[PDB]
Amino acid sequence: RSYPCDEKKQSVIAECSNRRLQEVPQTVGKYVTELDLSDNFITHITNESFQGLQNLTKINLNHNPNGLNITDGAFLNLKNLRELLLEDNQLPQIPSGLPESLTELSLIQNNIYNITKEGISRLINLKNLYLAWNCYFNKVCEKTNIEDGVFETLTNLELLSLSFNSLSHVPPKLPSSLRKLFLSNTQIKYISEEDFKGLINLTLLDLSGNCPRCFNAPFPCVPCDGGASINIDRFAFQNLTQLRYLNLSSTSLRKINAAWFKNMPHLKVLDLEFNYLVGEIASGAFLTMLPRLEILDLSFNYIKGSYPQHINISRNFSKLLSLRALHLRGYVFQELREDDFQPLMQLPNLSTINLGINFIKQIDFKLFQNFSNLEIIYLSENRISPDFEFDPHSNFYHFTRPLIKPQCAAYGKALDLSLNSIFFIGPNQFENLPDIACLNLSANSNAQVLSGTEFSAIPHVKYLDLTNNRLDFDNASALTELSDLEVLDLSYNSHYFRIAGVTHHLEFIQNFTNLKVLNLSHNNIYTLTDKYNLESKSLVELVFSGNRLDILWNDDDNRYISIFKGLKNLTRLDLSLNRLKHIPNEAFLNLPASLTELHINDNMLKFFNWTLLQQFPRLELLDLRGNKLLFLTDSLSDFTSSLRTLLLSHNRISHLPSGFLSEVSSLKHLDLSSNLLKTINKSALTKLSMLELHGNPFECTCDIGDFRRWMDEHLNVKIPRLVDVICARGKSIVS
Amino acid sequence: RSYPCDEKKQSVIAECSNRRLQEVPQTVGKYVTELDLSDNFITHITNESFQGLQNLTKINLNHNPNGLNITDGAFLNLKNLRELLLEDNQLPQIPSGLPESLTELSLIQNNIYNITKEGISRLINLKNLYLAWNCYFNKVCEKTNIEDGVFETLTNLELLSLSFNSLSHVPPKLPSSLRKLFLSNTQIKYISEEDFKGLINLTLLDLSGNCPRCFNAPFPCVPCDGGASINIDRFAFQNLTQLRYLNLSSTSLRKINAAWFKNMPHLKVLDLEFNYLVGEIASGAFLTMLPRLEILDLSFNYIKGSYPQHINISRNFSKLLSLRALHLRGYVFQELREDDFQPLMQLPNLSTINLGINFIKQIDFKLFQNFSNLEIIYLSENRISPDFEFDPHSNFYHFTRPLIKPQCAAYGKALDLSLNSIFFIGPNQFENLPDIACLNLSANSNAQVLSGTEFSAIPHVKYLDLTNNRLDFDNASALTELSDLEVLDLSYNSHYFRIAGVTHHLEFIQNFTNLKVLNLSHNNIYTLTDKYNLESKSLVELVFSGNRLDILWNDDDNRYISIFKGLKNLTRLDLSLNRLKHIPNEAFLNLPASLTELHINDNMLKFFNWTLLQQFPRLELLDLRGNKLLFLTDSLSDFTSSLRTLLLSHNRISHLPSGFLSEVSSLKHLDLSSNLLKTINKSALTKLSMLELHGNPFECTCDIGDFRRWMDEHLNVKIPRLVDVICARGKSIVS
Ligand SMILES: *[C@@H]1O[C@H](CO)[C@@H](O[C@@H]2O[C@H](CO)[C@@H](O[C@@H]3O[C@H](CO[C@H]4O[C@H](CO)[C@@H](O)[C@H](O)[C@@H]4O)[C@@H](O)[C@H](O[C@H]4O[C@H](CO)[C@@H](O)[C@H](O)[C@@H]4O)[C@@H]3O)[C@H](O)[C@H]2NC(C)=O)[C@H](O)[C@H]1NC(C)=O
Ligand SMILES: *[C@@H]1O[C@H](CO)[C@@H](O[C@@H]2O[C@H](CO)[C@@H](O[C@@H]3O[C@H](CO[C@H]4O[C@H](CO)[C@@H](O)[C@H](O)[C@@H]4O)[C@@H](O)[C@H](O[C@H]4O[C@H](CO)[C@@H](O)[C@H](O)[C@@H]4O)[C@@H]3O)[C@H](O)[C@H]2NC(C)=O)[C@H](O)[C@H]1NC(C)=O
Ligand SMILES: *[C@@H]1O[C@H](CO)[C@@H](O[C@@H]2O[C@H](CO)[C@@H](O[C@@H]3O[C@H](CO)[C@@H](O)[C@H](O)[C@@H]3O)[C@H](O)[C@H]2NC(C)=O)[C@H](O)[C@H]1NC(C)=O
Ligand SMILES: *[C@@H]1O[C@H](CO)[C@@H](O[C@@H]2O[C@H](CO)[C@@H](O[C@@H]3O[C@H](CO)[C@@H](O)[C@H](O)[C@@H]3O)[C@H](O)[C@H]2NC(C)=O)[C@H](O)[C@H]1NC(C)=O
Ligand SMILES: *[C@@H]1O[C@H](CO)[C@@H](O[C@@H]2O[C@H](CO)[C@@H](O)[C@H](O)[C@H]2NC(C)=O)[C@H](O)[C@H]1NC(C)=O
Ligand SMILES: *[C@@H]1O[C@H](CO)[C@@H](O[C@@H]2O[C@H](CO)[C@@H](O)[C@H](O)[C@H]2NC(C)=O)[C@H](O)[C@H]1NC(C)=O
Ligand SMILES: CCCCCc1cc2c(Cc3cccc(CN)c3)cccc2nc1N
Ligand SMILES: CCCCCc1cc2c(Cc3cccc(CN)c3)cccc2nc1N
Ligand SMILES: *[C@@H]1O[C@H](CO)[C@@H](O)[C@H](O)[C@H]1NC(C)=O
Ligand SMILES: *[C@@H]1O[C@H](CO)[C@@H](O)[C@H](O)[C@H]1NC(C)=O
Ligand SMILES: *[C@@H]1O[C@H](CO)[C@@H](O)[C@H](O)[C@H]1NC(C)=O
Ligand SMILES: *[C@@H]1O[C@H](CO)[C@@H](O)[C@H](O)[C@H]1NC(C)=O
Ligand SMILES: *[C@@H]1O[C@H](CO)[C@@H](O)[C@H](O)[C@H]1NC(C)=O
Ligand SMILES: *[C@@H]1O[C@H](CO)[C@@H](O)[C@H](O)[C@H]1NC(C)=O
Ligand SMILES: *[C@@H]1O[C@H](CO)[C@@H](O)[C@H](O)[C@H]1NC(C)=O
Ligand SMILES: *[C@@H]1O[C@H](CO)[C@@H](O)[C@H](O)[C@H]1NC(C)=O
Ligand SMILES: *[C@@H]1O[C@H](CO)[C@@H](O)[C@H](O)[C@H]1NC(C)=O
Ligand SMILES: *[C@@H]1O[C@H](CO)[C@@H](O)[C@H](O)[C@H]1NC(C)=O
Ligand SMILES: *[C@@H]1O[C@H](CO)[C@@H](O)[C@H](O)[C@H]1NC(C)=O
Ligand SMILES: *[C@@H]1O[C@H](CO)[C@@H](O)[C@H](O)[C@H]1NC(C)=O
């Protein structure tokens, strides 16, 4: 048992993050290799901080403290130190006399404005150097002075990142080992012919945000004089036969010179977001130069004040033969006509069209059929009708998450129409579409009574998202045309559920032979009409959080006592956030005997009838976190032989009953963190692999001794975050 | 300083609620008259519980414990006990040998099924007897046995309530002192001629929920055989000349006998909700019998399965000359035509029409003009387009809150169109309406760009509610036609605010010469377009909670540093729930010097620059509750002479600086509850009238003595909830 860090073996990692450590710990294990020490209160670092920690081949001192004084060659005597990370430390300078064994260095988010030979040129083994985000936006900081030639000694340098600094030009004397060159938001107007001419290995070049398009910028944005475009010499990308990824986002471009790509036969990803390329899109020769392009991002190229009827796509798109994804958000146009996308329809691997945020009013949906294999049709957010703000380690111009949830997209062809205005699905709404498997109609202000016919044209939908609408559930055949339905997400439709005098019919649930997952969360359900029960022979997982079981299962009311019992296959049930003070025993007994996993967290339970766990012989996880439980049973082993994980954090448990750890033979994980345990008696003292105790007011006196021994006896019981397992006054119990 | 209760003088009241008291306190003040002891853990009551507490003319033992054993005549020796309340106690019986001085008795929500002479007939001074809600719904309980004549001795009985018990008929031998008779939900099929014949003083009769209409009931509901109507003898309400309030809600009525009202010339409020009176509404003679009726509730009289084109209102409504409010929710019809309301238009005092929840599709709005003086036009929730569930002390069939917010209605003529489907305000949307002053368009899925013309037909709107829509704020003249605008509520319009690449224009705020109150809460505002500042010469109050000032006022960004300074008249600002870790001093200094009241609660502030309170010389209230403040300044008196209230609960303050209580000469209220104060030194020890300290881990040892003296010295400093001012282990500090 280590302290204050928590170790593992991936290759031996001392996770020592966030522990409020005030200086590097003396007490680290001697087989430790990677020591993560971020987010601590470390203020000073000397040579004698890592005195005897050898074969540390990684250090992380990010965010210290939560500015860091590092003496010169304080790391020098670590002859194995390879990866060093000292991001976000208000470092004034690249620290002096670093150990030349370093292969990866990260100085992101400091105050370093001077890149000197005295810090960098000795370090011949740098592969990846991260200096981004040191002088940017309206930060008080100085122009970035780069001593001449200071990189040419770094002949094993593969990745260099200087983004979000004021450079003004591409440094000269760049080693030709570079494969990845990041110069975004560096205030560079002009790209000369000599600028990259000897970088024959570059796979990636990022010149984004130089001469930026600043209208409506969510950050302080300085245009180039006259909102002028970036100036790229005609032979600037000569000799760059190995480029794969080119990012020219936000460089105010209006013209693309087709000859820029003459010597890039492999170009794979092109990013031209936030430029002014509406003209280039309609008639663009540069598109005939890219037969291996896979991803083209042309988002936010809208003309301010301009709302064209149709989008205008050059015939030249037809030539983009390897194109996989095409992103055209923020073009802004009223209508998508069948003719408008002819140039894309013969492209064989075009699987993703992104038309998000174009305020489109009508789509002639039949057009998506005439394509080859579209997989993701992304139309969200249109107008179709019946420390620190910016993360230095992600992409700055867009979100990188997938457009459509993987779990939904994995079923097949996907149509995301979320955040539109289809407030009512008419009879011909889905005429002429391909066989959609994944459908998002979230947030379309839909208030209709679904009745069994609305989806007849796409009857093979397998995952359906109708979250965040206002469905009026007043017809028992709703959605039953979707015989293949497997996932149905009905969250955040509380509008009509909340009104007691409108009708609520959920009977339809039973008709689905293949329904696996049903989410009814945040619907404020407390009254149903005519039928009180949920029935399905298939359903595996019901999410019923953010409803009102406190009302449903009121003591004076019997109507909903078997609400969930007809769910004969159910293995996971989420009853969290139901305002439950107590569950009547009979209603608890009528939960499906099939359950393996039951969540009743974040209610207000004062009591739990443990005895009833006898009728749930398959149950593996019981989650009661965030209630008001006062007492644990003394006889748990008598009610279950199945429970593997029991979660009880954020309750009011002050005493552990006899044999509680030893006697339950299937139980491996027990979470008692953040309760009211003053102690743990020797009488409470085996099949347990993890026990959580942080957050408790452990009275530290001579009485607390017995348990310590037990910890020493059982190393096989991980006890996390021992630093937070604390005497009630501050020291850990392990002192 | 009392303990454990907290006293006052209204006439001397010992508020002793909710204190976890385990028995009646010995230590009550001897001038105490009313002793509220509800919501405690009281289990037993004997004669020797109130030994020497005389001139107690009120006791409240509701919800004890949080069932109560009361010995016989345990209250007998209180010769002044007047009002006794023992609701919600699982009492098995009316307690025996109660003191005959009682004028008001409340036994609501117990288990009393036997109403005996041994408990009630002696008590000749009962005015008001509450026995409601003892056997109801699916509770395990017995039919209510009422010993014969047991009320006729109570000749000073004015109010009797037996609702929500199984009676089966109106008890006989009811004293003719009764003015108010509550028999709701008592399972009484038949009302005989003899039933009330000698009750010549009744002002109110409630026979609601006997033979109930049970379709879609939000409670276990037992129809009378055949869903039959209640049977009311033709001369059942003979001799009841003094009736004012008649409640016949949910008695399955289909016919009203006009002659029931022959001898009620004063009838004021008639409640016929949840019956089947569509026929009676269209052709109803009973309406010619009620020329003093003021309030008529005909809600939820819908025919299941039926959706008429027009509502059908008998000509006889024209005869309801004193009618003030008419409620017609849940009739359910498609269209309101001008002709359909002719019978109401000459009624002089008709100020309120309620058409909520009728799924109406079109209204011919010009019709509201032809009325006399309509004040509240309530149309919410239609389809217009471009312990314990039930509170025993409120009305069971409807919510009693006002239809329209008083603050909005106080400006004049009100139109509530909330929860409809006016997703777009067209040019003629508001043609032909009266001069609306108060307008609710909440929750209409409105996504348009308001532009300055939409309200031109009702330009004198003074309070405007557009909450819970999705407004696209992309035009600087939005709402500017409303030159008289005084209150503008823009909460919960985050849809477009949250998207960084759409435009956000709030410039319009400045054009309003009369804008007092602006709510921008829960809009997730973090980026504006072109103009970064909020400007108004009039605005008094800005609510900016649930936005992202953490982003706006990011350290690397200057654009929003004066966001609020142009609000030159501002006296109240709410910056709560902005995720603020810290406020740059310059942005804090640019808050309006006019401010008297500033809320920054529920953020995550680690530090507060108190020194800056020097530039806010009018500031009376500073609310920093629910942050992470570690330290208080030692020199507050140097930065302010205006602060009257300072609220610091839920922070991490462990020490009180010298002179903190004494030195600030304007400060009257200081809230330090729920921090981390182990003590309060004698050096921290005048103009203070209230100091809050409950929730702190006060170390109770010899050191804690000094402060106790100070408390004894200053009785003029209310310290609430001393019971919760607790040694860190359980006893109060005042022990
Ligand atoms: C202009 O356009 C270019 C070209 O697309 C963008 O280039 C990408 O830049 C992003 C952001 O810097 C890079 O993203 C990060 O890559 C790191 C390295 O990942 C590679 O190697 C690791 C193995 O070490 C693999 O696991 C991984 O699959 C990759 O093959 C990652 O470490 C980062 O992820 C980590 O941090 C993020 C922080 O958000 C966490 O969310 C993750 O969980 C993880 O811990 C991150 O993914 C990206 O690699 C660049 N692309 C290429 C091909 O090199 C530019 O950023 C863009 N410019 C601007 C300013 O927007
Ligand atoms: C059938 O229809 C009838 C006729 O309308 C309804 O009759 C009303 O019933 C309600 C609920 O019982 C009564 O409401 C309660 O009245 C109490 C007495 O208030 C009068 O006197 C006090 C002075 O003591 C005045 O302050 C007050 O203005 C009244 O003149 C109040 O004490 C109750 O309010 C208190 O408790 C509620 C609990 O919700 C709190 O919210 C309040 O803050 C307050 O503490 C309450 O208002 C009402 O008075 C009856 N009307 C008349 C004219 O007598 C029936 O209820 C209805 N039947 C059913 C089953 O719905
Ligand atoms: C409605 O509830 C459903 C069902 O629970 C929610 O979908 C599920 O969400 C969880 C995460 O919350 C997904 O599990 C996760 O999977 C990822 C990827 O494998 C993994 O990395 C995580 O550790 C976790 O296991 C789960 O796959 C997903 N299930 C389905 C069928 O999509 C849904 O999010 C809820 N809807 C709303 C609006 O809250
Ligand atoms: C948007 O913010 C406004 C302005 O603050 C909110 O309206 C105000 O709400 C408060 C209560 O939250 C009202 O004060 C209260 O008045 C009543 C009656 O006098 C009193 O009993 C209370 O003690 C309290 O003082 C205030 O009058 C009201 N102001 C106006 C102009 O209506 C509004 O509720 C917010 N909107 C949303 C949707 O949250
Ligand atoms: C349906 O569309 C909605 C809206 O685009 C998606 O909701 C987003 O999902 C992510 C991941 O949880 C959240 O972080 C965002 O907050 C959500 N956006 C909004 C506006 O709520 C949803 O995931 C889509 N559904 C599917 C199946 O892919
Ligand atoms: C505008 O209409 C909405 C919806 O009817 C009103 O919102 C309700 O107000 C009450 C009082 O705060 C809340 O308890 C309800 O939760 C609200 N309902 C909903 C659906 O949110 C609103 O008050 C009306 N505005 C005015 C000025 O009267
Ligand atoms: C992609 C972001 C475009 C931002 C501007 C913006 C454009 C909008 C449009 C398109 C449009 C662009 C330019 C001019 C016009 C005509 N006013 C419309 C339609 C509907 C709502 C519109 N709302 C907005 N906020
Ligand atoms: C006042 C509550 C009425 C409850 C029934 C109910 C009625 C609705 C109506 C009216 C209606 C009533 C009776 C029959 C019909 C025709 N299906 C419509 C229109 C639109 C949505 C409707 N949604 C509902 N849930
Ligand atoms: C760049 O390419 C051109 C022709 O493609 C060639 O003449 C020149 O030698 C190359 N430059 C370098 C430095 O390789
Ligand atoms: C499309 O991708 C497939 C593999 O998914 C590949 O075999 C094929 O060569 C690609 N076609 C083109 C024209 O790039
Ligand atoms: C559902 O709606 C369909 C289509 O109008 C209708 O025929 C059917 O009657 C409805 N079902 C029920 C159970 O009301
Ligand atoms: C749904 O299931 C019920 C009962 O199993 C059946 O009566 C009903 O007709 C079904 N509806 C459809 C459309 O399959
Ligand atoms: C029960 O669930 C399993 C696992 O999802 C599934 O294979 C089976 O079909 C379901 N049973 C029924 C009767 O639908
Ligand atoms: C648990 O519920 C059962 C009935 O299912 C009851 O007999 C038993 O007394 C309850 N146990 C506790 C501790 O409440
Ligand atoms: C009731 O009224 C009728 C006539 O209105 C009268 O004859 C009778 O005496 C009255 N009954 C009582 C008991 O007052
Ligand atoms: C209407 O109410 C007013 C007082 O607001 C009263 O003077 C008048 O008599 C009432 N009219 C009728 C017909 O009741
Ligand atoms: C607001 O909309 C009006 C009406 O179309 C238009 O004339 C005006 O140009 C718009 N204002 C701005 C500032 O765009
Ligand atoms: C609003 O105010 C601004 C500046 O005070 C002015 O230029 C603009 O024309 C105003 N618009 C209207 C409709 O009053
Ligand atoms: C400032 O507020 C006060 C109080 O609401 C108001 O009387 C005055 O008109 C406002 N001042 C201006 C310049 O609008
Ligand atoms: C408060 O802000 C002022 C600048 O307005 C600065 O001079 C001072 O140092 C700050 N005080 C603290 C305690 O941060």
Curated annotation (Swiss-Prot), chains A, B:
Keyword terms of this UniProt record: Disease variant, Disulfide bond, Endosome, Glycoprotein, Immunity, Inflammatory response, Innate immunity, Leucine-rich repeat, Membrane, Receptor, Repeat, Signal, Transmembrane, Transmembrane helix, Ubl conjugation
A GO cellular component annotation in the UniProt record: Golgi membrane
Post-translational modification: Ubiquitinated by RNF216; leading to degradation by the proteasome. Proteolytic processing occurs in monocytes and monocyte-derived macrophages by both furin-like proprotein convertase and cathepsins. The cleavage is necessary for dimer formation and subsequent activation.
Impact after mutating residue 472 to A: Abolishes responses to both ssRNA and chemical ligands
Domain LRRCT: 696-735
Effect ascribed to mutating residue 503 to A: Abolishes responses to both ssRNA and chemical ligands
Disulfide cross-links: 5-16, 135-141, 211-224, 214-221, 408-438, 700-727
Membrane topology value: Single-pass type I membrane protein
MF-aspect GO terms: DNA binding; double-stranded RNA binding; identical protein binding; pattern recognition receptor activity; RNA binding; signaling receptor activity; single-stranded RNA binding
Reported impact of residue 302 to A: Abolishes activation of NF-kappa-B
Subcellular localization: Endosome membrane
Positions in the Extracellular compartment: 1-735
Taxonomic superkingdom: Eukaryota
Tissue-wise expression: Expressed in myeloid dendritic cells, monocytes, and monocyte-derived dendritic cells.
One GO term of the biological process aspect: positive regulation of interferon-beta production
Regulation acting on activity, per entry: Activated by RNAs having enough uridines.
LRR repeats: 80-101, 102-122, 125-147, 156-177, 178-198, 201-222, 242-263, 266-288, 292-314, 322-343, 349-370, 373-386, 411-432, 435-456, 460-480, 484-506, 514-535, 538-559, 569-590, 594-614, 618-639, 642-663, 666-685
UniProt main location, coarse: membrane
Residues modified by glycosylation: 47, 55, 69, 114, 201, 239, 247, 312, 316, 349, 370, 440, 475, 511, 519, 569, 609, 681
Function: Endosomal receptor that plays a key role in innate and adaptive immunity. Controls host immune response against pathogens through recognition of RNA degradation products specific to microorganisms that are initially processed by RNASET2. Recognizes GU-rich single-stranded RNA (GU-rich RNA) derived from SARS-CoV-2, SARS-CoV-1 and HIV-1 viruses. Upon binding to agonists, undergoes dimerization that brings TIR domains from the two molecules into direct contact, leading to the recruitment of TIR-containing downstream adapter MYD88 through homotypic interaction.
Annotated family: Belongs to the Toll-like receptor family.
Binding partners and assembly: Homodimer. Interacts with MYD88 via their respective TIR domains. Interacts with UNC93B1. Interacts with BTK. Interacts with SMPDL3B.
Disease linked to the protein: Immunodeficiency 98 with autoinflammation, X-linked: An X-linked disorder characterized by onset of recurrent infections associated with lymphoproliferation and autoinflammation in the first decade of life. Mostly males are affected; carrier females may have mild symptoms. Features include mouth ulcers, fever, poor early growth, hepatosplenomegaly, lymphadenopathy, polyarthritis, and non-infectious enteritis.
Protein name: Toll-like receptor 8
Gene (UniProt): TLR8
Boundaries of the shown chain within the full protein: 32 to 816 of 1041
